[PDB]
Give the backbone structure.
Amino acid sequence: APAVPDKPVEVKGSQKTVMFPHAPHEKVECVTCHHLVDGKESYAKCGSSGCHDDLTAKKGEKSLYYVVHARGELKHTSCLACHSKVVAEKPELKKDLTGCAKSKCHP
Ligand code: HEC
Ligand code: HEC
Ligand code: HEC
Ligand code: HEC
């Protein structure tokens, strides 16, 4: 796989800007985040050709909002998903990882 960027990449969602650091995610299998596509390893931007590059839907596989939060049972493992289990480790962090605001996601 490509060389993991030691720098965080901005994820200009709908309006608010959120940057995700890889360092803090250098112990989590890529797949874990970079799910497979048609059983074909890929690493295209969250919003790559025929992917999640439409925040005008709000709900749908063509949305980068229902695959970012969705802390429910999804095909893969959403962010808020994992973070969910994490909170089960540092109950005193139920926000920094799962915070709508005043967090490391929504400052
Ligand atoms: C990282 C740990 C996040 C936490 C915690 C929360 N959100 Fe978030 N949010 C995140 C990203 C990376 C983005 C960019 C675009 C996307 O949808 O992934 C967002 C964006 C939003 C948006 C804008 C999208 C839209 O539908 O207009 C909203 C409204 C939003 N986030 C709300 C929200 C709430 C209510 C949260 C607490 C449950 C929350 N976010 C947590 C990443 C992260
Ligand atoms: C979630 C905890 C992740 C893990 C684990 C890894 N990466 Fe990642 N990567 C993540 C996000 C949220 C993004 C961009 C978000 C967006 O909306 O664009 C990325 C982006 C990359 C990129 C750039 C293009 C792309 O594939 O999106 C590369 C080259 C990349 N990531 C590499 C990479 C590798 C090699 C990983 C395993 C060692 C890896 N990432 C894990 C989130 C996450
Ligand atoms: C195009 C090559 C894609 C890119 C880039 C990413 N994903 Fe994706 N994802 C893609 C498809 C075609 C589908 C449909 C699922 C199916 O049943 O075939 C998905 C699905 C997801 C899901 C599950 C859907 C849900 O219930 O919300 C999640 C959680 C998801 N994708 C996350 C995700 C993230 C975070 C990405 C960037 C880091 C990402 N995908 C890139 C195709 C593509
Ligand atoms: C488990 C499989 C995870 C998934 C999926 C995602 N993240 Fe995560 N995140 C995880 C851990 C264990 C931690 C703690 C940091 C550590 O030392 O391991 C985090 C932290 C973050 C942070 C804060 C970074 C910090 O300095 O504490 C952010 C902003 C964050 N995570 C964002 C994020 C996004 C946007 C994800 C989906 C694209 C995502 N995480 C997935 C574990 C996991």
